Amino acid sequence: GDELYRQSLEIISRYLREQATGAKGATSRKALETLRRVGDGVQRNHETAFQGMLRKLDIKNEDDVKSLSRVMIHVFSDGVTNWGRIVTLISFGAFVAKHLKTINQESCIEPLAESITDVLVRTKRDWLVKQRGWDGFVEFFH
Numbered sequence: 554g555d556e557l558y559r560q561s562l563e564i565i566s567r568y569l570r571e572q573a574t575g576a577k578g579a580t581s582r583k584a585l586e587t588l589r590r591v592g593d594g595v596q597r598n599h600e601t602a603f604q605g606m607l608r609k610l611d612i613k614n615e616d617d618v619k620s621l622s623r624v625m626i627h628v629f630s631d632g633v634t635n636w637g638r639i640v641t642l643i644s645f646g647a648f649v650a651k652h653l654k655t656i657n658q659e660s661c662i663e664p665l666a667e668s669i670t671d672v673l674v675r676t677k678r679d680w681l682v683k684q685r686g687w688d689g690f691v692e693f694f695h
């Protein structure tokens with residue numbers, strides 16, 4: 554097993570889907586409430602950049618969402634790894650998730666999640682371990 558990966562995918566998965574479907578172990582549940590508060594804050598403050606980036610990505614179907622990976626890696630990894638940019642990575646994900654339910658492609662949400670987790674855990678794995686993973690996440694937005 555890879556429990557940072559499956560915890561990461563569980564949290565990002567349900568955060569994205571509840572964000573698009575309106576709504577809605579113990580560590581995963583505190584991370585998810587943290588990521589509601591912070592997540593919705595960030596989507597409201599970067600909303601001008603977020604819609605700029607959404608419209609420029611132009612996601613229509615699920616082969617779009619599968620292309621997204623390496624532009625994700627590009628925008629995301631600028632070395633100086635920190636929770637702020639991680640949570641922006643997830644929250645933009647949510648932004649995209651609600652836009653995919655608008656155009657009635659909820660089927661792409663879980664691939665999208667599977668991509669975000671996939672970028673995150675594979676590009677920051679050592680940093681995330683050194684910060685005790687999602688317990689670091691929760692206690693950083695304490």
Ligand SMILES: Cc1cc(OCCCc2c(C(=O)NS(=O)(=O)c3ccccc3)[nH]c3ccccc23)cc(C)c1Cl
Nearest residue numbers: 602603606621624625628629637638641642645646669
């Ligand atoms: C699901 C998905 C997520 C993606 O995340 C990218 C990194 C997060 C991000 C920043 C960002 O990091 N901006 S920043 O350098 O000024 C920054 C760094 C730390 C805390 C707050 C802001 N600006 C953004 C503007 C628009 C969209 C996302 C961001 C990227 C892609 C392609 C997809 Cl398909």
